[PDB]
Symmetry: C2
Subunit: 369 residues, 2 copies
């Protein structure tokens, strides 16, 4: 709807968890090209950012949880460094359309120049190993938001989803030092994936507001990956925010009825995409729809307020629902917010204001020391 | 001379020590632009690579020797990682004219496609600190040639020029392990800057041929930075080679008669360049000339043979002589070699064949284990 795009276009938009960097190392993949989620599996690229009115976001440096050993740590360090480098290479290859942002002023300046701004975030800090000086290493290369853990516990903190249960009851002693270093450098702490203990300790100990880069409310869907109302409010009352995820909102159990993207031939990739597409069409996956996404956002808005909510759909990280396939559908969020009675001020806060405020606060504290 | 360029153009050329990366971080500096050594201080860029017929080379990740402390090592690690990243950014910004090479096949393939090939080398391995796993970290980002030390001794080995003398009498115990790791990964060991003890131990212990990325013969000029005939032959007899340097060939003592390039204003840089130029014109520095460069090359050729000699002039690292100001003068080397009676086969070996053979051997050993 051109009417929706017009309204949407008036706001500075950003998503706090673009997993798109996972595609950067794919042979011949170019963010400048237009892709189809059905054929490429990607949900983000420049053409679609323009079509969906997405002005920028936090490009994720993500790594799955591996061994808590010296070999695991060295592997993780190198892997994350390389993923960070891939992001910097994308930016170096697209200077006229993209630019790295380190501060909120950078974001606004880049936006005014007509370019997409790219902040850098980390999902799973397993890569720092036992050497916290690596946090600054990543900071020097652009890191401005980081979560200590992913799906399983690591040397820094407990995950909300580890099948083996808790081991630290929040942050490990090393993790507490990690939190202190993130605060000192001015990196926004991301609790998405972390256990409730980590959330509680983060709010209690962090010198700056924290964030949940991609989470939801247990009130809408009871899953460890979501937060109860009390914690949503706690994060918000401390100046933080929760960015709305598009998954963990419904039972995805499938009805009774992949190649290495970094080395597979373009034909091979097309092959699986085609088979997959047919399967998804014959027996659609249970993902919920756009109304469900707004149901989640609206509930968090009620509990955390318009200043404690943001957008983090998990694009390229498994996100997506019926009527919310990729970023081209983002304008629908702005439409529903208006239709729900939210002012432009609140919509602006939700699309970027709240996140940029959190970034400012984190970096303000860092400067103060 | 178009006649010289025609001959020169027939060979695949590469220099083993392009310090050019030191300019990559300079504000607005672009390798695609044409520069004048007199105004920009640079001796390498795409236009001049084309004019001089330089097909590629090893782009250096260099760092001066600092403190042998935890603080020094973390600083060195981060610095070298950033310099490596700057090189990768240059490559990402110039995909149609440049491409990173990891193997000799890459070099030839890239050359055939009409692009300049860029290998990555390290000068001073101080950045690995006490953590040898970092060697692989750099390897994963492109490192294929590395020297353990620079002007002063470090935690890995003795330098040939440290004013305080020797401390390890070659490699330290950590340095021996470093040599073993370089061999295991398939990184070519570079002894330029290392003490004679390091040279002797490298030939005796290395599982693969080694190289002197930019050195000369003591026979022509007696300086610690050059090698005696016995060591030249030793390196060659082990399958290695010595790449001819353009400095340390004459007494540079000046007759009786600079801003931060990364932060100075284009005008300020021009200012110094102009003053400097006038000074260099009024009272030329003692640098020798092109004949002296060939005198060095010819002597090493006599001792090491046509299979143990290569080119490493120290461009952007202090190299240059009268009649050999920058890479536009490279064709003169090919002319003199012919004029001296060397076949095309030998000239080809000297310009790239020998180096690529050494790279192949290093990587062949790595694969074998
Ligand atoms: Cl997730
Ligand atoms: Cl030198
Ligand atoms: Zn993710
Ligand atoms: Zn996630
Ligand atoms: Zn150098
Ligand atoms: Zn040097």
């Amino acid at each position: 709807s051109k009417a929706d795009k017009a309204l949407h276009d008036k706001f500075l938009t950003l998503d706090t968890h673009l997993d798109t960097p996972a595609h950067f190392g794919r042979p011949g993949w170019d963010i400048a090209d237009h892709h189809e989620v059905e054929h490429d599996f990607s949900q983000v690229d420049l053409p679609r950012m323009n079509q969906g009115g997405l002005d920028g976001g936090f490009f994720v440096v993500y790594i799955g949880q591996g061994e808590l050993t010296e070999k695991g740590y060295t592997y993780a360090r190198d892997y994350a460094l390389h993923r960070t480098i891939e992001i910097r290479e994308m930016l170096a290859a697209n200077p006229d359309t993209f630019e790295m942002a380190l501060t909120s002023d950078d974001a606004r300046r880049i936006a005014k120049a007509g370019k997409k701004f790219a902040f850098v975030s980390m999902e799973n800090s397993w890569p720092v190993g036992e050497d916290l000086s690596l946090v600054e290493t990543f900071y020097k290369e652009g890191l401005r938001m980081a979560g200590p853990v992913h799906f399983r516990n690591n040397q820094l903190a407990d995950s909300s989803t580890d099948p083996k249960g808790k081991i630290w009851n929040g942050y490990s002693p090393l993790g507490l030092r990690w939190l202190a270093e993130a605060n000192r450098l001015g990196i926004v702490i991301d609790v998405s994936h972390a256990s409730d203990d980590v959330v509680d300790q983060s709010v209690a100990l962090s010198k700056a507001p924290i964030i949940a880069s991609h989470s939801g409310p247990k009130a809408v869907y009871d899953h460890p990956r979501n937060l109860d109302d009390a914690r949503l409010k706690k994060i918000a009352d401390a100046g933080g925010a929760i960015c709305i995820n598009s998954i963990y909102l419904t039972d995805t159990t499938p009805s009774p009825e992949a190649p290495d993207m970094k080395t597979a031939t373009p034909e091979a990739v097309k092959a699986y995409a085609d088979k997959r597409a047919a399967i998804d069409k014959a027996h659609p996956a249970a993902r919920g729809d756009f109304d469900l996404y707004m149901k989640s956002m609206l509930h968090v808005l009620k509990v955390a307020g318009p200043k404690g909510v943001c957008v983090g759909a998990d694009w390229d990280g498994g996100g997506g629902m019926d009527g919310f396939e990729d970023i081209t559908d983002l304008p629908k969020i702005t439409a529903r917010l208006k239709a729900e009675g939210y002012s432009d001020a609140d919509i602006e806060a939700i699309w970027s204001g709240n996140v940029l405020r959190i970034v400012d606060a984190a970096q303000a504290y860092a400067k103060s020391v």
